[PDB]
Amino acid sequence: GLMQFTLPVRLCKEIELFHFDIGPFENMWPGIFVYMVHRSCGTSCFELEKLCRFIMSVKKNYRRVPYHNWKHAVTVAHCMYAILQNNHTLFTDLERKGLLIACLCHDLDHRGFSNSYLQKFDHPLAALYSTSTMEQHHFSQTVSILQLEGHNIFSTLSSSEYEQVLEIIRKAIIATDLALYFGNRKQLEEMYQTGSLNLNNQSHRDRVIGLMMTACDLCSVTKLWPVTKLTANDIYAEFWAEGDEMKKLGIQPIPMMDRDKKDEVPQGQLGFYNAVAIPCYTTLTQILPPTEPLLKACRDNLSQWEKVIRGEE
Ligand SMILES: COc1c(C)cnc(CSc2nc3ccc4ncsc4c3[nH]2)c1C
Numbered sequence: 484g485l486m487q488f489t490l491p492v493r494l495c496k497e498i499e500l501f502h503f504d505i506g507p508f509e510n511m512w513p514g515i516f517v518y519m520v521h522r523s524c525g526t527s528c529f530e531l532e533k534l535c536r537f538i539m540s541v542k543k544n545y546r547r548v549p550y551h552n553w554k555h556a557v558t559v560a561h562c563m564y565a566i567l568q569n570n571h572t573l574f575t576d577l578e579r580k581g582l583l584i585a586c587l588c589h590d591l592d593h594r595g596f597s598n599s600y601l602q603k604f605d606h607p608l609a610a611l612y613s614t615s616t617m618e619q620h621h622f623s624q625t626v627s628i629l630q631l632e633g634h635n636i637f638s639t640l641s642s643s644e645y646e647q648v649l650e651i652i653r654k655a656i657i658a659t660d661l662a663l664y665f666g667n668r669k670q671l672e673e674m675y676q677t678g679s680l681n682l683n684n685q686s687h688r689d690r691v692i693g694l695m696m697t698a699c700d701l702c703s704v705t706k707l708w709p710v711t712k713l714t715a716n717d718i719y720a721e722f723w724a725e726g727d728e729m730k731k732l733g734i735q736p737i738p739m740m741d742r743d744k745k746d747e748v749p750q751g752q753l754g755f756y757n758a759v760a761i762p763c764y765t766t767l768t769q770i771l772p773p774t775e776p777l778l779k780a781c782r783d784n785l786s787q788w789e790k791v792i793r794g795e796e
């Protein structure tokens with residue numbers, strides 16, 4: 484009960500900054516997550532015995548893929564940690580509990596393949612879940628792990644609070660489907676500008692949490708340039724493998740997934756920052772002003788990709 488996690492001084496300080504990288508020491512990632520749960524939520528939110536057993540079952544159910552791996556899970560949870568800490572009063576106790584767990588679980592059992600590849604392959608999961616195929620799977624895997632003996636970290640919630648938290652997690656994980664992000668941000672953009680946005684309206688909160696989930700999921704673009712650049716190698720390693728598998732089905736992949744079009748990556752990154760990233764962190768910064776450091780970091784990284792094209796790197 485009086486057992487805190489503590490981190491080395493550099494980590495204790497840098498973990499509070501949006502641009503923190505969790506490092507290459509896999510064995511420290513669980514403690515980093517527990518540390519974030521303790522400061523964000525409380526040392527009492529979860530029985531440490533059950534939390535530790537939950538964390539290790541979730542870790543085991545991530546696969547050895549270049550990008551959608553256990554490192555990504557903890558990275559996305561840290562970005563959520565930094566949002567929640569810079570917005571102390573805006574979130575309920577149930578939301579702070581649910582959203583870190585949601586982030587840890589959001590890509591459970593990812594195979595390194597998009598919803599599109601599953602549908603064109605005719606993968607069984609595409610028959611079970613017609614839209615947001617992998618994301619419904621991710622939530623399914625979350626429920627399964629919560630129902631293992633000794634793994635139910637929510638056991639001390641009332642029946643209504645248990646139902647509310649699972650519904651927060653479900654919406655949070657579904658929202659990480661990028662196909663849904665575009666319309667969600669447009670709606671939030673309209674609501675903010677016409678002044679109709681109301682954080683006591685549950686359907687409005689849901690939308691805001693959706694956008695926080697996209698922001699954390701894409702947080703690779705908000706790190707320092709060398710982290711952003713080296714993460715992009717992992718992202719394209721998965722995409723180019725999918726492109727190879729499209730060619731095996733006799734389908735030309737989109738250029739993003741065709742390794743024969745490596746040369747156009749810098750131009751592709753520009754489209755992506757302008758169409759997805761910058762819009763995401765701009766609407767988020769309008770709704771939650773203390774998340775501005777994410778928008779600033781994203782714009783710095785857009786400038787670095789502009790420099791790559793102009794042959795300065
Ligand atoms: C996971 O989201 C991402 C992150 C964080 C960073 N980068 C990307 C890739 S964006 C991207 N869009 C395009 C369009 C054409 C194209 N031709 C050759 S590479 C390439 C692209 N890369 C994604 C999808």
Ligand SMILES: [Mg+2]
Binds near residue numbers: 589617659660
């Ligand atoms: Mg995902």
Ligand SMILES: [Zn+2]
Binds near residue numbers: 589
């Ligand atoms: Zn993800």
